[PDB]
Amino acid sequence: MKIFLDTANIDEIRTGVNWGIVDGVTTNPCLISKEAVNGKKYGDIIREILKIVDGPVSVEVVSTKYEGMVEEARKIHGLGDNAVVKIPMTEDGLRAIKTLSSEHINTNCTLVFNPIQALLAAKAGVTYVSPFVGRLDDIGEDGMQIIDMIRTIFNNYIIKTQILVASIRNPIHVLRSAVIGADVVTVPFNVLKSLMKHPKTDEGLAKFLECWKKVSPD
Amino acid sequence: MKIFLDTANIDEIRTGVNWGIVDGVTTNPCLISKEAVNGKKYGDIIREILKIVDGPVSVEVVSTKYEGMVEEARKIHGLGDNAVVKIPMTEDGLRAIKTLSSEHINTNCTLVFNPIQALLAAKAGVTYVSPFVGRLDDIGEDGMQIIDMIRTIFNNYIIKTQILVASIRNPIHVLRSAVIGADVVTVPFNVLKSLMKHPKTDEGLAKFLECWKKVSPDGKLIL
Amino acid sequence: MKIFLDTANIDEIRTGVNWGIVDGVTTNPCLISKEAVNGKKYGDIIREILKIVDGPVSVEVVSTKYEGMVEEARKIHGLGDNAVVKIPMTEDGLRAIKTLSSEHINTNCTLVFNPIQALLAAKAGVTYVSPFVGRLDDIGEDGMQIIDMIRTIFNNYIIKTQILVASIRNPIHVLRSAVIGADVVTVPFNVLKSLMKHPKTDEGLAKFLECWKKVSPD
Amino acid sequence: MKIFLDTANIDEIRTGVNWGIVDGVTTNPCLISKEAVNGKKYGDIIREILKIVDGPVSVEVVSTKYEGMVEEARKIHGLGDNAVVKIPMTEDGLRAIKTLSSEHINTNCTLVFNPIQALLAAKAGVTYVSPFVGRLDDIGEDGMQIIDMIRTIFNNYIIKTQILVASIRNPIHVLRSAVIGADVVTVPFNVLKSLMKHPKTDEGLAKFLECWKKVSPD
Amino acid sequence: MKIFLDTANIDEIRTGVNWGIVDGVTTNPCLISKEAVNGKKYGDIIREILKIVDGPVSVEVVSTKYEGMVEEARKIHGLGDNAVVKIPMTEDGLRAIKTLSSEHINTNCTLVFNPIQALLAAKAGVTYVSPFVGRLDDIGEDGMQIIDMIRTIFNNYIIKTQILVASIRNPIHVLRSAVIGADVVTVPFNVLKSLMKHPKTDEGLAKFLECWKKVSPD
Amino acid sequence: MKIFLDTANIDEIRTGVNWGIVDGVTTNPCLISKEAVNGKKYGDIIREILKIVDGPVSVEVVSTKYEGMVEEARKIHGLGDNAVVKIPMTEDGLRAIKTLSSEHINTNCTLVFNPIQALLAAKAGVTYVSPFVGRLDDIGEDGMQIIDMIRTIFNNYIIKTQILVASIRNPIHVLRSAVIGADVVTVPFNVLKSLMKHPKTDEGLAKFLECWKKVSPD
Amino acid sequence: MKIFLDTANIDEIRTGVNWGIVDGVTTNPCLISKEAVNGKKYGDIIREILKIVDGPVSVEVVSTKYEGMVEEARKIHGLGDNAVVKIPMTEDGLRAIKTLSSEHINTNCTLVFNPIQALLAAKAGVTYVSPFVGRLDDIGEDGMQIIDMIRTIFNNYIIKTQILVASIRNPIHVLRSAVIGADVVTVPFNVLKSLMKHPKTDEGLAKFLECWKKVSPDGKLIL
Amino acid sequence: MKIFLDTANIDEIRTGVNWGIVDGVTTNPCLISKEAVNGKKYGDIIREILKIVDGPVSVEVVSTKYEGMVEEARKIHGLGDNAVVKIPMTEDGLRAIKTLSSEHINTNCTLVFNPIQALLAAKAGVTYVSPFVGRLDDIGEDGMQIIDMIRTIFNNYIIKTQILVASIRNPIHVLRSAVIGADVVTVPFNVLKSLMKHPKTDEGLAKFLECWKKVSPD
Ligand SMILES: *[C@@H](CO)[C@@H](O)[C@H](O)[C@H](O)COP(=O)(O)O
Numbered sequence A, C, D, E, F, H: 001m002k003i004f005l006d007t008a009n010i011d012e013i014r015t016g017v018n019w020g021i022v023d024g025v026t027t028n029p030c031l032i033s034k035e036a037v038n039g040k041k042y043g044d045i046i047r048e049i050l051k052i053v054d055g056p057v058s059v060e061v062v063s064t065k066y067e068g069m070v071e072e073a074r075k076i077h078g079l080g081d082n083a084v085v086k087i088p089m090t091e092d093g094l095r096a097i098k099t100l101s102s103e104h105i106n107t108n109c110t111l112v113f114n115p116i117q118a119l120l121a122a123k124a125g126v127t128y129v130s131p132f133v134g135r136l137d138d139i140g141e142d143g144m145q146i147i148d149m150i151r152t153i154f155n156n157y158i159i160k161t162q163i164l165v166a167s168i169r170n171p172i173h174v175l176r177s178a179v180i181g182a183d184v185v186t187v188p189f190n191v192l193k194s195l196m197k198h199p200k201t202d203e204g205l206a207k208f209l210e211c212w213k214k215v216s217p218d
Numbered sequence B, G: 001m002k003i004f005l006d007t008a009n010i011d012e013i014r015t016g017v018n019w020g021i022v023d024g025v026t027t028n029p030c031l032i033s034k035e036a037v038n039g040k041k042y043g044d045i046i047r048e049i050l051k052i053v054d055g056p057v058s059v060e061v062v063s064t065k066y067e068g069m070v071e072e073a074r075k076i077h078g079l080g081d082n083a084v085v086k087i088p089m090t091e092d093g094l095r096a097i098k099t100l101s102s103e104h105i106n107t108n109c110t111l112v113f114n115p116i117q118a119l120l121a122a123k124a125g126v127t128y129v130s131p132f133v134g135r136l137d138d139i140g141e142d143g144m145q146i147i148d149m150i151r152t153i154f155n156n157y158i159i160k161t162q163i164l165v166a167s168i169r170n171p172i173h174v175l176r177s178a179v180i181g182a183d184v185v186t187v188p189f190n191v192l193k194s195l196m197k198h199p200k201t202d203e204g205l206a207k208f209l210e211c212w213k214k215v216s217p218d219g220k221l222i223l
């Protein structure tokens, strides 16, 4: 399972890349605008991320119409071979995904909330589909059940689109995604750092070091 | 399923190897410090186990920092080709696993208590991952459930890291590991010995002896 | 299922009580210390909550020894008949719960992380037991499975201790708690506020407004 | 399981009432506005339905604020003892439901789309809660699953609010509601009439007729 | 589980009655037209079955309109208190059932092919509902699955209508009906006779006899 | 679960009764004829068993016709109040069971090989029904599955006939019968004596006695 | 579910009773002989436990014959009303249970390894039956499965004999017993102590202490 | 699935081999001692079986020490290429199996009672492993569950050791072994003889004979 970082914060990205467990990054207009303060410009933020991250970096178009989306997507593609163009699940978005797929521009269909939406994005040729589990949780539906159905559907038809679990809120979204077999999770930094930790690990380290000090003063 | 002995006791290790049922050994600093009493050096204990065991022998680093771990790991690797470097599930541990993996030094990520820790260790390229079932049992969760989920996750992604069930306390840990499909169990010597035994085996053996005396007073098979 | 509010924030409590959907309140030392800032004393915060809320209000002892816990518990009990004494799952805490229960002082055993701890709390006579699901989620274990087991154990022995699901982080903790049959959930305010909402509720109201305006322009 | 008709069409109600299979009626602002054309007035439609239906008749308030909802509810109540006041799942609606319940005015909480909304409606004392299965179907989630969860939740807490499955589109919604154990279904007239029919019933009737003509030509 | 005989043949009924395993009889226009030949009139056939059979005997109306069904049902009723009036699942049939139920005339709704039809008949007050499992098998649907759903539905609502499995073709319809818990099965004579038989029963009697000859040649 | 002894051997019966775990005895013509050798007569064998056993003793009739079976059954009844008359699953046997049931003579229907046969015996009023699990095993059908279905069927209709598992061959027939909830098992002597035994019991006894000898020389 | 302490150590027993979490005690001849060292008589150990424990205390007979068992059982019964006579699953044991049952002496059938043994003990009228889960674990079968079947069998027949899970080795035996619905578990002291503990409890306690020092330097609750 | 005959009785072996349904033979010291009576020597019995049976013939060592087992095994191997050396699951037995396997002498590990013992035997390189189901049944544990677990374990690791189900007592052991997928069953002669038979086979043949006699009196 690939693990991406769901942030535009340079420091978090830099920190997680230095850990060796971050395989890419996803952004969206709100994540970027959070960092585009104190004079920093959205374009610098994106270019800086594309540089630090050797894996896929997803960058969302802001136009809502087919022609604007394809033009922004070509501009995004031109920023680096690892850029992935994030495109909403809309009629124009599906059209743009199909056109960009033929141009060999990698794409990520976002704002997906049910399995048939995910299937339509895959049929348009999208590289990744991003169902938003946390926002389903917010409205009282277990979001992970949609991941499970998408995994079954994609397996049924040998679909090559990667399931990219997004809107992740806690380490159990991550656990369940791996158990289901989703291809990718993207996680906020606070979640990423928790995934390595467990109280019994720390307890165990402490006890092992005490045994070592019985045989080695240094 | 491979079966490793989880001890640093040399008499136990020779005895188990002699049965032909031990495929390797795991140690940790507490297991080693138990045997390093009355003049026995830790380094001699490690070197002796490496000598008598043909299979993998896991030896744990004691540094907690990335640099100390990789330096110590290269030294452990240098002691014999069957040495496997045991490294804890920490941020520095994962970085060390990735570096050592690329240097073709076999690694065993230890102190793992949930399936996502295990997956992270796999992603860093570790040779073996060791979830501690008995210590999960101690805190009131069925540790074998974590083995089951790890096996499913590894199957999903065709992960080559071997699942090495550790902190084994009883033969049902072993039975459930085999049914799940864990690659390896590491067991204390007391557990190892019990795996061979069953009261009906003893009983059947005595009955076959009694039957054979009816046909051969000296109990031999003359063919 | 009763729904408690898991905060010491007086404004949040007043709002949720005014919504009519809050059956009680849980606090803990960290929640209280968050509010006891810039002159506001912790004793005033506790008393104000007890006054506002008609339902049970859980207030945690701070001593770690049997004698200290019981003494603090009686002071807590004396603040109001709706006070419930929150006591940690420890050896002294069990002894304290047994004494307070024999004194007909309602108790709430907290910091519970597995079903056997919850059972021990029930055997000491505790009124409520509070397993922490979100903290279990944090360490890579699905906390709700512990609630499911506790419900089964409690059903097996006709246990009268109420299961109070705590450390709740999202509305699916709440949903799964109701499907399991937990007696109480205690929820932070941002979770509480989301429980009434659904985008199809908002949409349906807007469509109903359009139809009514056709037969009544006023 | 009670079966209500989901229409404001007086001919459909008369027809289905004359069948003896209709236990009540649900309306909503859009259903009424469809029939309030060519001089027909919403007040007369409502009064005529109340007159013809012995059982419960659900009439929805149009105000969105607590005080207007309660005042409308009392006027709806005054129109007949069989009237049930339909109130949306909103903060103000929950407040209205609680006030009307205490006044022994029967209520029906509408625009419910998940099981926790339904529980909050029951906790306010609502007589009926109406989850909208077809509108869930429309957005790619199997709406009957929410009915199943509500049934389990209500059973767990011995909740007396009746489950009134609404937004019904086909006879399988009806069948699944009956197998789950929902208290009430409300159905459009075209669904209602199909519930009695089956090709093998028609075929069997013709066969028995032919056999009867061999013994009695007349 | 009660067991009825599904035939109008007098010698079959008399034979099954002599065995003590027949609790009632069902007929229909075709079963009656098969025996009403060579000078035998349908009126004598019905009266003669009523006389032999102590328990319920179902006799079908031939009218297809409400008034005729109701008038015919009264004539059937007057023939004997064990007579049960069989009425088809139609609009007029439900109306007739409800009228006859208010007149304390036992009824049996026939030509039922799905569970919701069965529920409608129960709602009209019918004493027995008869789903046709064999005719569903004929069209490629496992008819026993309809019995299972009807059992669940009736259990859910504590429905007093008895499930009468009809159109039985083999002993496994009987086995499955009893495992499900259907109230009654009605069986053709060739099925009824087979129910008592098993080749290991025959073989066991032979062996027991052989042993008895050794100890007692008499 | 009651445990009966399936034998006519006086010594086995005497031995098992002296153990306190034998609640009754079942016989059949072959079991009796095995003991009716060296001059011993079948009548003495039966009378001797009726004397040693305070629980039900089943004694099979040898006639195959209704009138002979009832006359033999009345003779068997006259031998003692604990006698149970065993009667094969046949048309005449069912008739005899119904007649004897009215006379308050306890009966046991034997040679039952499927669940519908068991149901028919229960409908005739039989006290016990004896399905033969071992003889189904012999012909390649798991006999315990028939016990399971009979238990479900009898539970469904609150049937008071006791399920008496017969043709028992091993302790797993016994285990599965108890897990299913059969009322009675009847077991051959070699099976009965094995039920108390386990190697770990003997191993445990030996180890406990060695500890006792460390604190007590005697 | 009741929780008994499976020991004859008086310090353990007083300590557990003091927690208020021990509802009774089980002993056996090996547990008692462990404490009858350096002058301590077995009879004084039994009498002391009977004195300090308010709940049931199971004390095992040492005779293997029916007559010896009932005589010894009447003496055990006479030592206090909370004494429960522990009797092995044997032919003589079942006869002894039936006699003692009719004399209103509470009994605990021990050394049970399968569900039908348990049912036979119930049929003889025993108060408690003690299946040994840990010793089934030792021979490679999941002993908790036997508890589950016994619970089902007892439920089927409304049997009043209490299921007393014994030979408990870890907290998962306890957890699974509670989920199954066993009436009683008897546990060694080490297991008992672990049941109260969890690392997240410790961690949460330390964090609540730290929060409270921000509002009260002396860490007290002044109300 | 191969079917072996579990006996040393030469007449039974000749008969089963003549039936063409016997793929091999297993023996053990008790089975051989049963036949080696009244002058017949055990060495002649073994040699005669090896001659008659074309398939594998399992012959158990009698020594309990490694050196003795290996020496006896080579003498066994030398009697015929179809000899298989049966070795008990003991510490020395595992060592012996490992040595013999490296010498390409086929082995059969016996007295296996749980799945881990079977796994240990496979790891020593044994050709066949023989779990004893009937002896497990004897002690109140369903022996077939051990076969099910061994199959799963062996499948997990692609183990080439054949599962040879032994201590078989009835045809349902055989049926369940085939459904599980065990490689071999070894059966006593009275079990083997029953596997071909079924009362409906006999009945069907008799009916077919009657029909043929109508078109052909000869
Ligand atoms: C792009 C698609 O993978 C991501 O940046 C998504 O927008 C976020 O994962 C959405 O998460 P929130 O629901 O927390 O905004």
Ligand SMILES: *[C@@H](CO)[C@@H](O)[C@H](O)[C@H](O)COP(=O)(O)O
Residues within 6 Å of the ligand: B006, B026, B027, B028, B031, B058, B086, B108, B110, B111, B130, B132, B134, B135, B164, B166, B167, B168, B186
């Ligand atoms: C190394 C990991 O393979 C092993 O030595 C583990 O440290 C032990 O298995 C841990 O067991 P304990 O919980 O008994 O220390």
Ligand SMILES: *[C@@H](CO)[C@@H](O)[C@H](O)[C@H](O)COP(=O)(O)O
Residues within 6 Å of the ligand: C006, C026, C027, C028, C031, C058, C086, C108, C110, C111, C130, C132, C134, C135, C164, C166, C167, C168, C186
């Ligand atoms: C008291 C117990 O009901 C509560 O205040 C709990 O301490 C909190 O629910 C714990 O939540 P966090 O894990 O978010 O502190």
Ligand SMILES: *[C@@H](CO)[C@@H](O)[C@H](O)[C@H](O)COP(=O)(O)O
Residues within 6 Å of the ligand: D006, D026, D027, D028, D031, D058, D086, D108, D110, D130, D132, D134, D135, D164, D166, D167, D168, D186
């Ligand atoms: C009232 C609630 O019982 C009903 O009139 C509902 O508004 C309708 O059932 C909703 O149906 P549509 O989704 O077809 O509007």
Ligand SMILES: *[C@@H](CO)[C@@H](O)[C@H](O)[C@H](O)COP(=O)(O)O
Residues within 6 Å of the ligand: E006, E026, E027, E028, E031, E058, E086, E108, E110, E111, E130, E132, E134, E135, E164, E166, E167, E168, E186
């Ligand atoms: C009346 C309903 O109980 C019955 O006589 C049914 O008409 C028959 O059972 C139908 O059987 P066929 O499908 O074989 O006509």
Ligand SMILES: *[C@@H](CO)[C@@H](O)[C@H](O)[C@H](O)COP(=O)(O)O
Residues within 6 Å of the ligand: F006, F026, F027, F028, F031, F058, F086, F108, F110, F130, F132, F134, F135, F164, F165, F166, F167, F168, F186
């Ligand atoms: C009477 C009915 O319970 C019993 O004696 C049965 O005849 C035997 O249990 C039959 O067993 P076999 O199949 O072994 O004869």
Ligand SMILES: *[C@@H](CO)[C@@H](O)[C@H](O)[C@H](O)COP(=O)(O)O
Residues within 6 Å of the ligand: G006, G026, G027, G028, G031, G058, G086, G108, G110, G111, G130, G132, G134, G135, G164, G166, G167, G168, G186
């Ligand atoms: C009596 C039965 O309740 C107990 O003392 C049992 O003997 C022990 O629980 C057995 O445990 P071990 O297997 O550890 O001896």
Ligand SMILES: *[C@@H](CO)[C@@H](O)[C@H](O)[C@H](O)COP(=O)(O)O
Residues within 6 Å of the ligand: H006, H026, H027, H028, H031, H058, H086, H108, H110, H111, H130, H132, H134, H135, H164, H166, H167, H168, H186
């Ligand atoms: C050799 C192993 O395949 C066989 O002869 C076994 O020993 C027997 O199958 C064991 O059967 P019993 O339990 O009936 O002795």
